[PDB]
Structures are given as C-alpha cells and as structure tokens.
Enzyme design. Structure first.
Site, PDB file in Angstrom:
ATOM      1  N   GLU A   1       0.820  -1.205   0.000  1.00 41.95           N
ATOM      2  CA  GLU A   1       0.000   0.000   0.000  1.00 41.95           C
ATOM      3  C   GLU A   1       0.858   1.260   0.000  1.00 41.95           C
ATOM      4  O   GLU A   1       0.488   2.260  -0.623  1.00 41.95           O
ATOM      5  CB  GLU A   1      -0.944   0.000   1.203  1.00 41.95           C
TER       6      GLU A   1
ATOM      7  N   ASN B   1      -8.905   9.186  -5.245  1.00 46.75           N
ATOM      8  CA  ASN B   1      -9.859   8.173  -5.677  1.00 46.75           C
ATOM      9  C   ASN B   1     -10.805   8.739  -6.733  1.00 46.75           C
ATOM     10  O   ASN B   1     -10.829   9.941  -7.009  1.00 46.75           O
ATOM     11  CB  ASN B   1     -10.662   7.632  -4.488  1.00 46.75           C
TER      12      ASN B   1
ATOM     13  N   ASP C   1     -14.242   8.865  -6.819  1.00 48.91           N
ATOM     14  CA  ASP C   1     -15.410   9.608  -6.360  1.00 48.91           C
ATOM     15  C   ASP C   1     -15.055  10.910  -5.652  1.00 48.91           C
ATOM     16  O   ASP C   1     -15.957  11.585  -5.144  1.00 48.91           O
ATOM     17  CB  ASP C   1     -16.261   8.731  -5.435  1.00 48.91           C
TER      18      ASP C   1
ATOM     19  N   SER D   1     -12.761  11.066  -3.047  1.00 48.10           N
ATOM     20  CA  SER D   1     -12.125  10.770  -1.774  1.00 48.10           C
ATOM     21  C   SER D   1     -10.618  10.582  -1.960  1.00 48.10           C
ATOM     22  O   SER D   1     -10.099  10.570  -3.077  1.00 48.10           O
ATOM     23  CB  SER D   1     -12.753   9.528  -1.145  1.00 48.10           C
TER      24      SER D   1
ATOM     25  N   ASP E   1      -7.016   8.525  -0.020  1.00 43.54           N
ATOM     26  CA  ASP E   1      -6.444   7.607   0.957  1.00 43.54           C
ATOM     27  C   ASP E   1      -5.147   8.178   1.517  1.00 43.54           C
ATOM     28  O   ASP E   1      -4.336   8.745   0.780  1.00 43.54           O
ATOM     29  CB  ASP E   1      -6.178   6.239   0.329  1.00 43.54           C
TER      30      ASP E   1
ATOM     31  N   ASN F   1      -9.422   5.609   3.867  1.00 42.91           N
ATOM     32  CA  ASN F   1     -10.273   6.382   2.969  1.00 42.91           C
ATOM     33  C   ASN F   1     -11.071   7.440   3.724  1.00 42.91           C
ATOM     34  O   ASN F   1     -11.581   7.197   4.821  1.00 42.91           O
ATOM     35  CB  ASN F   1     -11.232   5.452   2.221  1.00 42.91           C
TER      36      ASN F   1
ATOM     37  N   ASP G   1     -15.930  -3.387  11.028  1.00 44.14           N
ATOM     38  CA  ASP G   1     -17.212  -2.999  10.451  1.00 44.14           C
ATOM     39  C   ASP G   1     -17.981  -4.170   9.852  1.00 44.14           C
ATOM     40  O   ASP G   1     -19.117  -3.976   9.404  1.00 44.14           O
ATOM     41  CB  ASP G   1     -17.009  -1.913   9.387  1.00 44.14           C
TER      42      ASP G   1
END
Ligand SMILES: [Br-]
Ligand SMILES: [Br-]
Ligand SMILES: [Br-]
Ligand SMILES: [Br-]
Ligand SMILES: [Br-]
Ligand SMILES: [Br-]
Ligand SMILES: [Br-]
Ligand code: NA
Length: 129
Positions: A35, A46, A48, A50, A52, A59, A101
């Site tokens: 990463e 990203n 949309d 967003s 990271d 995110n 989550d």
C-alpha cells in the site's frame, strides 16, 4: 518517514496490532509494503473524490475528514492529516474500527490481491522479536 522491514514490524507489535481480530503481524506488514512501500507520507486520490492517507491508505469517505469530500462521514473522528505522521498511532487505532465494520481486512484491496493466501510470515523473517 521510510520505515525498515523489521523496524515497522516492531512498531506495529507495540501498538497491539499483531493478531488483532485474528490477523497475524505478517499480514499488516505485507499490507503496508504494497500500500505504501513503508512510507508514512503516501497519499492517493480516488474516483469519487475521496483520498487515501498514510501507511495503510485510510479512505476519507467514512473514516476521516479532509474537508473536500461532500456528503461523507467522519466515523474515526479525526483529521486525515493525522495519518501521515512519523508516529503510526492514529493509523493503527482507526484501522481497528475499519476492520471491525463486518468485512475484516477485505476493506484493503491491496491485501486481498497481494497478501491474502501467501507466505506472510516471510515478511518478518530474520527480525528480532
Ligand atoms: Br523489503
Ligand atoms: Br506472520
Ligand atoms: Br468533507
Ligand atoms: Br483540492
Ligand atoms: Br459521522
Ligand atoms: Br511509531
Ligand atoms: Br474477519
Ligand atoms: Na469524511
């Protein structure tokens, strides 16, 4: 800061990340390598809108607030910039809620594609732990 292989492994273990929710230390070190290449100052945009941030590329759509993501949430209650520090405390704590989550470490696309099902223990081989 660019971490060393054995250096980052010791830092993750000190913060109680090893075997958190059933994921061994080699899994988190393998995820950080692909990463971020062990670089805490990595950022990537990203589709949309967003972004990271950090050694684990968290995110901004749900977890942190960068002020430029319309209609988003701040479930970790922290500014995104906190995940770029030379200290990895903020990235680890939010990663614990992300992994809880309901989907596990599958929230990180790089881990599923490059670490899931490999010899993850070789990433801590030779280190003094
Ligand atoms: Br390496
Ligand atoms: Br391991
Ligand atoms: Br925002
Ligand atoms: Br901007
Ligand atoms: Br919220
Ligand atoms: Br640290
Ligand atoms: Br799980
Ligand atoms: Na946000």
């Amino acid at each position: 800061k660019v971490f060393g292989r054995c250096e980052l492994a010791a830092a993750m273990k000190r913060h109680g990340l090893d075997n958190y929710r059933g994921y061994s230390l080699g899994n988190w070190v393998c995820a950080a390598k692909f990463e971020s290449n062990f670089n805490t100052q990595a950022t990537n945009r990203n589709t949309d809108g967003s972004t990271d941030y950090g050694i684990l590329q968290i995110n901004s759509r749900w977890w942190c607030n960068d002020g430029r993501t319309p209609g988003s949430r701040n479930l970790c209650n922290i500014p995104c910039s906190a995940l770029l520090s030379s200290d990895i405390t903020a990235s680890v704590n939010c990663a614990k809620k992300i992994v809880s989550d309901g989907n596990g470490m599958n929230a990180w696309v790089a881990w599923r594609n490059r670490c899931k099902g490999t010899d993850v223990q070789a990433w801590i081989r030779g280190c003094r732990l």
